Amino acid sequence: SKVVYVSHDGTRRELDVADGVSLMQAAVSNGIYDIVGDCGGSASCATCHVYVNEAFTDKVPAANEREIGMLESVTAELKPNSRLSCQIIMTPELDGIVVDVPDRQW
Numbered sequence: 600s601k602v603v604y605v606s607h608d609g610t611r612r613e614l615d616v617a618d619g620v621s622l623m624q625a626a627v628s629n630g631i632y633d634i635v636g637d638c639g640g641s642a643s644c645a646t647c648h649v650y651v652n653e654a655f656t657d658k659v660p661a662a663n664e665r666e667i668g669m670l671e672s673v674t675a676e677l678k679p680n681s682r683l684s685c686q687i688i689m690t691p692e693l694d695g696i697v698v699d700v701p702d703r704q705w
């Protein structure tokens with residue numbers, strides 16, 4: 600399924616992500632270095648911070664308690680649509696989703 604990553608400077612990178620793969624896993628495995636994933640995807644580092652696009656902040660599953668708590672550690676600006684890319688799991692229903700990577704993760 601399609602996922603679009605928009606960097607700080609507006610550069611756009613589109614990837615084909617399989618079911619069950621997190622947006623963080625797909626990013627780091629494809630050279631989208633704006634996303635780090637320091638903790639490995641267990642929601643404990645906040646270095647995979649991303650701003651989910653408004654056309655999907657409704658679609659994607661709401662943030663869990665652990666994510667909510669770890670989000671406070673993001674170094675970039677925390678917004679209403681700030682999510683940890685490692686918590687967004689790809690499915691056909693998310694096809695076309697767009698997320699913007701913060702100016703920084705640290």
Ligand code: FES
Binds near residue numbers: 637
């Ligand atoms: S990869 Fe560490 S919190 Fe998402």
